[PDB]
Amino acid sequence: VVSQYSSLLSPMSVNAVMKVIDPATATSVDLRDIKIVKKLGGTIDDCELVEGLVLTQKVSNSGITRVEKAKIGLIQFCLSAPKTDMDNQIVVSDYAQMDRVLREERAYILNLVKQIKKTGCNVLLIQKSILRDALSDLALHFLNKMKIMVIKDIEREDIEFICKTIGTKPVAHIDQFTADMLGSAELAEEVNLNGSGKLLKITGCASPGKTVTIVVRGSNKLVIEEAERSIHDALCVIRCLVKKRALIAGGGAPEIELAL
Amino acid sequence: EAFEAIPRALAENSGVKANEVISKLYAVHQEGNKNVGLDIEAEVPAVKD
Amino acid sequence: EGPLSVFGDRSTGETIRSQNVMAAASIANIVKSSLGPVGLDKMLVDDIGDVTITNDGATILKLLEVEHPAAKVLCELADLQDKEVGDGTTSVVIIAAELLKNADELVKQKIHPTSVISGYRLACKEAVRYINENLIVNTDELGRDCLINAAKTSMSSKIIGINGDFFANMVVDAVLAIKYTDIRGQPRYPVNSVNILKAHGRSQMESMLISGYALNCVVGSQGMPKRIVNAKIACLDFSLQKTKMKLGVQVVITDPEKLDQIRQRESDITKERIQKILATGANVILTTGGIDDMCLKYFVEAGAMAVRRVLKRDLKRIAKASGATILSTLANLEGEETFEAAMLGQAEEVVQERICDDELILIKNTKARTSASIILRGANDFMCDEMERSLHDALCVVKRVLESKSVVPGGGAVEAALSIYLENYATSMGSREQLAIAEFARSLLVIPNTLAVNAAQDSTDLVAKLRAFHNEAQVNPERKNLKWIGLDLSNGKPRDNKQAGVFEPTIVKVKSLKFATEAAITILRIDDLIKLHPES
Amino acid sequence: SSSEDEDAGEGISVNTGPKGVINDWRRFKQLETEQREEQCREMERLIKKLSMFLQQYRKQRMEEMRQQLHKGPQFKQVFEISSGEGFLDMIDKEQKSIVIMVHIY
Amino acid sequence: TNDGATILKQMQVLHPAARMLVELSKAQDIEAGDGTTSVVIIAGSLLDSCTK
Amino acid sequence: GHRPVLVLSQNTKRESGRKVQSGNINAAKTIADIIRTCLGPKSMMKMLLDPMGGIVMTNDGNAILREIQVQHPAAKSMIEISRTQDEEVGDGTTSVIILAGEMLSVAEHFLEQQMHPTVVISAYRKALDDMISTLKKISIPVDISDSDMMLNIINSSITTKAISRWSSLACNIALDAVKMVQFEENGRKEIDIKKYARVEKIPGGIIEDSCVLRGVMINKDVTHPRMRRYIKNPRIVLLDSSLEYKKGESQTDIEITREEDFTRILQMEEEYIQQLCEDIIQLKPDVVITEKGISDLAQHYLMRANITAIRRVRKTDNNRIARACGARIVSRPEELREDDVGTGAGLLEIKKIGDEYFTFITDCKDPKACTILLRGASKEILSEVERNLQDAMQVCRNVLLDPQLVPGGGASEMAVAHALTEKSKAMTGVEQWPYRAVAQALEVIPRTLIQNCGASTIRLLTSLRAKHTQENCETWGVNGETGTLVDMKELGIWEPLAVKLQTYKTAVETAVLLLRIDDIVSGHKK
Amino acid sequence: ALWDVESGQLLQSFVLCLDLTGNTFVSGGAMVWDMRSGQCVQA
Numbered sequence A: 001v002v003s004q005y006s007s008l009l010s011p012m013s014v015n016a017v018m019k020v021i022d023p024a025t026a027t028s029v030d031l032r033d034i035k036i037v038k039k040l041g042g043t044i045d046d047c048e049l050v051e052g053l054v055l056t057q058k059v060s061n062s063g064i065t066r067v068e069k070a071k072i073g074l075i076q077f078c079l080s081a082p083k084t085d086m087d088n089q090i091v092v093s094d095y096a097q098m099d100r101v102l103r104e105e106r107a108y109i110l111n112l113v114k115q116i117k118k119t120g121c122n123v124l125l126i127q128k129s130i131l132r133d134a135l136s137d138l139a140l141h142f143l144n145k146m147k148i149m150v151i152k153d154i155e156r157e158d159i160e161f162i163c164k165t166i167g168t169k170p171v172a173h174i175d176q177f178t179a180d181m182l183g184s185a186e187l188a189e190e191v192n193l194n195g196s197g198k199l200l201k202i203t204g205c206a207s208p209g210k211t212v213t214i215v216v217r218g219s220n221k222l223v224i225e226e227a228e229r230s231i232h233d234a235l236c237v238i239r240c241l242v243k244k245r246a247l248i249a250g251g252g253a254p255e256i257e258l259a260l
Numbered sequence B: 001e002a003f004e005a006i007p008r009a010l011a012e013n014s015g016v017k018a019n020e021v022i023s024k025l026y027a028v029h030q031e032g033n034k035n036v037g038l039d040i041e042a043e044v045p046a047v048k049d
Numbered sequence C: 001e002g003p004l005s006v007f008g009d010r011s012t013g014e015t016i017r018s019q020n021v022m023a024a025a026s027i028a029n030i031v032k033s034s035l036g037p038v039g040l041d042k043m044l045v046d047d048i049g050d051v052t053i054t055n056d057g058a059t060i061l062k063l064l065e066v067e068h069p070a071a072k073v074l075c076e077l078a079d080l081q082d083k084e085v086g087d088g089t090t091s092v093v094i095i096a097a098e099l100l101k102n103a104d105e106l107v108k109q110k111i112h113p114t115s116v117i118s119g120y121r122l123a124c125k126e127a128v129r130y131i132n133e134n135l136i137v138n139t140d141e142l143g144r145d146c147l148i149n150a151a152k153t154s155m156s157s158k159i160i161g162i163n164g165d166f167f168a169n170m171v172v173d174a175v176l177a178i179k180y181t182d183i184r185g186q187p188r189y190p191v192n193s194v195n196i197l198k199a200h201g202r203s204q205m206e207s208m209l210i211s212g213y214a215l216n217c218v219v220g221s222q223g224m225p226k227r228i229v230n231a232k233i234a235c236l237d238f239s240l241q242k243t244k245m246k247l248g249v250q251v252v253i254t255d256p257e258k259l260d261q262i263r264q265r266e267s268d269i270t271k272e273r274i275q276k277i278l279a280t281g282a283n284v285i286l287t288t289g290g291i292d293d294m295c296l297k298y299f300v301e302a303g304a305m306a307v308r309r310v311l312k313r314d315l316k317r318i319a320k321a322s323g324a325t326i327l328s329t330l331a332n333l334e335g336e337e338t339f340e341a342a343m344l345g346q347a348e349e350v351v352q353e354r355i356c357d358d359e360l361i362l363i364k365n366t367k368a369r370t371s372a373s374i375i376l377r378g379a380n381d382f383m384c385d386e387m388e389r390s391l392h393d394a395l396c397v398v399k400r401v402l403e404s405k406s407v408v409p410g411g412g413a414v415e416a417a418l419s420i421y422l423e424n425y426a427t428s429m430g431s432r433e434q435l436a437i438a439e440f441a442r443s444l445l446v447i448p449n450t451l452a453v454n455a456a457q458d459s460t461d462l463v464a465k466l467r468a469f470h471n472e473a474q475v476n477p478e479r480k481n482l483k484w485i486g487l488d489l490s491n492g493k494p495r496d497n498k499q500a501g502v503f504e505p506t507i508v509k510v511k512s513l514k515f516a517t518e519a520a521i522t523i524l525r526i527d528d529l530i531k532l533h534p535e536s
Numbered sequence D: 001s002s003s004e005d006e007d008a009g010e011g012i013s014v015n016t017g018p019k020g021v022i023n024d025w026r027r028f029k030q031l032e033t034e035q036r037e038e039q040c041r042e043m044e045r046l047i048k049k050l051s052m053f054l055q056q057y058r059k060q061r062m063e064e065m066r067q068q069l070h071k072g073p074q075f076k077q078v079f080e081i082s083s084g085e086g087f088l089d090m091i092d093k094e095q096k097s098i099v100i101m102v103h104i105y
Numbered sequence E: 001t002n003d004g005a006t007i008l009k010q011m012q013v014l015h016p017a018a019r020m021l022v023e024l025s026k027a028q029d030i031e032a033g034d035g036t037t038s039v040v041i042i043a044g045s046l047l048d049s050c051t052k
Numbered sequence F: 001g002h003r004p005v006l007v008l009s010q011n012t013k014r015e016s017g018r019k020v021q022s023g024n025i026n027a028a029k030t031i032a033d034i035i036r037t038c039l040g041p042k043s044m045m046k047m048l049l050d051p052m053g054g055i056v057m058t059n060d061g062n063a064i065l066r067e068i069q070v071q072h073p074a075a076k077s078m079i080e081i082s083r084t085q086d087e088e089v090g091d092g093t094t095s096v097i098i099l100a101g102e103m104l105s106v107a108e109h110f111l112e113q114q115m116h117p118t119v120v121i122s123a124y125r126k127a128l129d130d131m132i133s134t135l136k137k138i139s140i141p142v143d144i145s146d147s148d149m150m151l152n153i154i155n156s157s158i159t160t161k162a163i164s165r166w167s168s169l170a171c172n173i174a175l176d177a178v179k180m181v182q183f184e185e186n187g188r189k190e191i192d193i194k195k196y197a198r199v200e201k202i203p204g205g206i207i208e209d210s211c212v213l214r215g216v217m218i219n220k221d222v223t224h225p226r227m228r229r230y231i232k233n234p235r236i237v238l239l240d241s242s243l244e245y246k247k248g249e250s251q252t253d254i255e256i257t258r259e260e261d262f263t264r265i266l267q268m269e270e271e272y273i274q275q276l277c278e279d280i281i282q283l284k285p286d287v288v289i290t291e292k293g294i295s296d297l298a299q300h301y302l303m304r305a306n307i308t309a310i311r312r313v314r315k316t317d318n319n320r321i322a323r324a325c326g327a328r329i330v331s332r333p334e335e336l337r338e339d340d341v342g343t344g345a346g347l348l349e350i351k352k353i354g355d356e357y358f359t360f361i362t363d364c365k366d367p368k369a370c371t372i373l374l375r376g377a378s379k380e381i382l383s384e385v386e387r388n389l390q391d392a393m394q395v396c397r398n399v400l401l402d403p404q405l406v407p408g409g410g411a412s413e414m415a416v417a418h419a420l421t422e423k424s425k426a427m428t429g430v431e432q433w434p435y436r437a438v439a440q441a442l443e444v445i446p447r448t449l450i451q452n453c454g455a456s457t458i459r460l461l462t463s464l465r466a467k468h469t470q471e472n473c474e475t476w477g478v479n480g481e482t483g484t485l486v487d488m489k490e491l492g493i494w495e496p497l498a499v500k501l502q503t504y505k506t507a508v509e510t511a512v513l514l515l516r517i518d519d520i521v522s523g524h525k526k
Numbered sequence G: 001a002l003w004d005v006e007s008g009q010l011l012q013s014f015v016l017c018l019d020l021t022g023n024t025f026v027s028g029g030a031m032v033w034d035m036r037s038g039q040c041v042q043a
């Protein structure tokens, strides 16, 4: 169905394949390195090839939706009240212990946020967490106070893709959160799709290593799904051409020659 | 007034505005012409003898 | 049944094509009678007696129960047009259905659907180019009158059409009030920041445009004052209740003497927080969370308002308009618990106003930013809901006109001119793409035809006169001003709609054309339907 | 800013088993035959029919007159059938040359 | 859809030969990614010849 | 197999065309005809059977309409507009329904004659504008300081109700309650008769004993019999928190390893109760009212200081007490201050009415809240009396907010009709006919009054029209009891301008809303 | 089947009802399984 858009889609697919492989060494193409994001709205002419990373998660911050000269870091721990893996309870037997607990929790959260900020990071990605609060309201308030754009609920399965895209090494303990663990980027902003939703795009990276994202847009869901399938077909055709460097004529010529 | 339903129905079926036809009919009848009715073969409200 | 052995029903070829066209025509005919100034509203009953008197195409198509896939495609097309533009929701559906009908008529003549799709795509591109190059009017030559005219045009066919002279002024004032510039110097207008409150009572002409913000909320306690002159608004995103320990904290008492102190602290913590908030000088306290009775008493004794369960978006709008800062907690970077006066919004008045046995908060004349709110008064709730829908349509139209500064004449002028131009232009492209583009041009004429039909006038004669005027404009270089001629539905004669003030944003027409063309192509690609039997 | 869109073995020929089970077979067969007789008596009419100035008779008035002044002793009541078998053995018994009229109500 | 593999997978065919054809189209999609419609047609034509 | 295929879902109906308009107009006319006979001083009551077994024997239009369940959406819209009229101005409920029905009836004629509904709606809106202008022109001012004028206005409001027999007492009660509720703080005038003018109905007695109290009255007794049931000048302290030991918010568990800890903890509970009671007593009050429970030990400690306690008073009742006696509700007794203590009540008396105890806090000096004690034959009679009193208080507050008056008895209807016809005499377009239709359909109120009175509609209406064709005859209406024409300056039947404006606006807007509608669709789910 | 909540991964796949130290659990249709060895230990 996407044939009037071939002038836009075919160079898009060719570039997408060529930007995820080494032309002089590659013998196969991993199509998982080409992420496809389907967003309802617009027309198929609005399909875009994004060099960097496109995230469907919303920004938890308010008033901070565009960072220039971004320093992105991944967090695989939780910014909430301390909680050990084994069973833990806090026993209060005196009235002073109450506000002592409150103050100490505040100090712990503030120290965590200060340690994160001291590395120069201004965009923070927090992995999705179960059984513990990944991001706390106090932690979110402290991060907002220090002008750090926070995106939480990052899926575990996407960690490898994000690390390959923006060159950010994931951090699981605050003691190992240093400057070199971050990934520099030119721009990380949340764009608006003309009222059809919001997308977070991190375009322009110091080390853009073999990863591209394709954003597919359309009027209705069915045409978007079929456009995605057709783009996948084109990518698979280029993958075949990469695997075996042999071209043949089309339009039934091989079948007629074979029959004769 | 109940006699107006006949020219009104004729005008409605003919596809024109009944009120204009009835107004023209009253005007021409007050003028003194009692043999004037609506013109079927017309695209606009019109009357003829 | 047969050699295929598929558990379901299969339709192929002309049968499924006719089914799709029938479904599209049904969807179009549902809303075809609600187009243009001589359109009429509809009642929708929700199987439990709920009544929705509406004229918006998107509302009608969302409320309906639709089963056929092509009908669902048209309904979601209307929804997309509503979301992305806000106007022309009926026109896009009608145009898409007419395009599909004419394309199927071409296909029945053994014209291949690929040729029809290519012709439709070429015709849509050429129509957009012609609209952008010939039929656009820059708003800089008109001024504030253009916005009012566009709003009035959008308010036609709506329950607020006759009172347009007043409603359009209110809409323009609200949209201009909610305007503020951003980075890169692009002044954009955040509609949906105009709070719209519906309250039955007096006539529509007594609807109020608030120079501030309006809350659907009341003061927490009857002992609080119900009017503050120099309001110092404090916006909070936390509850003011008795302090309770988290899951990981337990109170275990081995010496009984500590129980009284612990129980005292449990409320003294919130008491101290409220004491700080009042000591900074705040007069109005708005919080998204709840407020306990003792905290309400604290506010009452302090002589200050306190509103609980405020909606998050309302609180955000109030904080932005008044200069306040939302605080989810009282915690500075020193580890303490403070509240300085720099985080207080200001307003020239906050009043508890009574509207038909219901009370609401009015925040009048917020400083550091202007905000607008609209209160609609009507006979009953259905009328107020339809008024709100029409008001939203008008606000969206005004926003489109202000963002993109080009407008096009209304009343079928654009469609007639496009039909003439595309009918002439089809002869210079292809052999069967000629037929496809000609059918696209003839399908574009459904809008003026529907307008004329809704007025119980001679659609054929009026459309012929309009086409003659536009053809004369296109063929005669010195009669180019005739391209502004549209349809005057009150008198049933062609009229220069640019001079008459019938204006529409160009984005409405362009997006409608693109979306309708894509939907028609999507439906036209189908030539076989397999309907698997449900597993239930 | 914040203000945005947000806001096999088939042949069996069984030999003796039928002899052993004929007791239960006839036990069920007698009741089944009674049911067939009852339903035959019903279907004899049901479904089959369920599917679908001397003329002024002044004498009708005096017919009513002596029908009212008919007899002296008690006029008795119409016999009521309480069981389907009651209807079956009422129609089956009794002299054949005597008309029986039944009123379904 | 026009993709052969998607068409074959979506309609729940019941005959075993049809299921093997669906698996064949899936294998063609895995190895190549294009031609998932041509391979099923080729197999059907080959078996049609096998009839005679 | 082979299930049917169709575009819209099953059981989705749709009607369109002239049929929908005719059905809507007929539904509106039926709704109007339901309560046509409940208008005027000679209206007759209707007995409604509530689904829950109750009986509503009333004359108010809104109550009758809200007691009726209908299926046609037009009837639903009519019931909704009746409710909105009741909520906005307090009366005119049966007039607006009749007016809307008549307007739709006269619009049907033009709909049947190839006139688009948009033209009719435009004519209706122009007519409504001129109606408002004429109503404002023929209005007269009122001196709100004149008690006699206010009483006469309330009388004219309640001459049509069942309370017209005791009209004088009813008017005095309504005026006193409205003037007592009137309040102004921080430069905001407020007359909140919904929350501070409470009507209490006690079956039995005679209606002549009903009165408005300079205070509040609740159905409560003393917690302990030793407490005084009669205090001359009580100092009242109001609470909204429990006076008993309660568990904390946080999860708390004690751990006892020594012998005396259990008795010690129980003694601390007793000491906490004593501390709360001492904190209350330090202000030296005479009576304590709270919304939550009072423990027995707290009752003992309060009685030791000669303090009467009422245990569980509702929030609204406590607010009314605070307004009446000048108190301030507090939650923590340790923060109680002298200002919060409510002095101003002139008597606390807990007497027995029938077989129940009632608490009276009457005799207040300058109370801002009041209770209306109603005695009568039965519960239904008292409910109807309460509805009539609500109408009277709403009319009084409308007059207080807007001091304009317009003639009653259909005089305003005929005056506005004549003015509208005179204005239409200069109209030249096709819009003049529906304009005059609205003008003449306005005459349905005097016609209904004449019909309910039993007089000849045609002769009286023609005479009234001829009289209104003169110059100084805008105040000439119809006497709804004797069935004769009379100047309203003599009969004195005047009604607030706000009520008439609301009625006219609601009727015209309902007519416009129902005229805008076509193509009814029904049967879909949510 | 037993799944890890935090990582969202299937630890090991092995039953109308079952019940459980989170290492040995019994499943009834007894079938006691030990996670340290991944084998049935009692019947």
Ligand SMILES: Nc1ncnc2c1ncn2[C@@H]1O[C@H](COP(=O)(O)OP(=O)(O)O)[C@@H](O)[C@H]1O
Pocket (backbone or CB within 6 Å): C034, C035, C036, C037, C055, C056, C057, C086, C087, C088, C089, C090, C091, C092, C153, C154, C156, C157, C158, C409, C410, C411, C412, C447, C451, C486, C487, C488, C489, C502, C504
């Ligand atoms: N005063 C007017 N005179 C002539 N045509 C008008 C007038 N106002 C609106 N129209 C036309 O009526 C058409 C239908 O608009 P409408 O259906 O009410 O908007 P929507 O499609 O958003 O529901 C528009 O295309 C517009 O050009």
Ligand SMILES: Nc1ncnc2c1ncn2[C@@H]1O[C@H](COP(=O)(O)OP(=O)(O)O)[C@@H](O)[C@H]1O
Pocket (backbone or CB within 6 Å): A249, A250, A251, A252, E004, E034, E035, E036, E037, E038
């Ligand atoms: N422009 C064209 N002209 C002639 N033949 C074409 C053209 N494009 C594709 N084909 C032929 O159509 C056949 C089917 O291709 P396609 O439908 O895209 O995928 P599949 O092989 O899965 O059906 C191919 O064998 C190709 O040779």
Ligand SMILES: Nc1ncnc2c1ncn2[C@@H]1O[C@H](COP(=O)(O)OP(=O)(O)O)[C@@H](O)[C@H]1O
Pocket (backbone or CB within 6 Å): F038, F039, F040, F041, F043, F060, F061, F091, F092, F093, F094, F095, F096, F156, F157, F159, F160, F407, F408, F409, F410, F411, F449, F478, F479, F480, F481, F493, F495
């Ligand atoms: N004594 C009277 N004589 C004539 N008309 C009266 C008299 N009292 C009231 N009316 C008229 O009756 C109307 C009030 O009737 P009512 O039953 O209160 O209807 P609604 O509930 O709609 O106000 C007023 O418009 C007034 O003009």
Ligand SMILES: [Mg+2]
Pocket (backbone or CB within 6 Å): C087, C088, C089, C154, C393
């Ligand atoms: Mg519109």
Ligand SMILES: [Mg+2]
Pocket (backbone or CB within 6 Å): F091, F092, F157, F160, F391
């Ligand atoms: Mg009244």
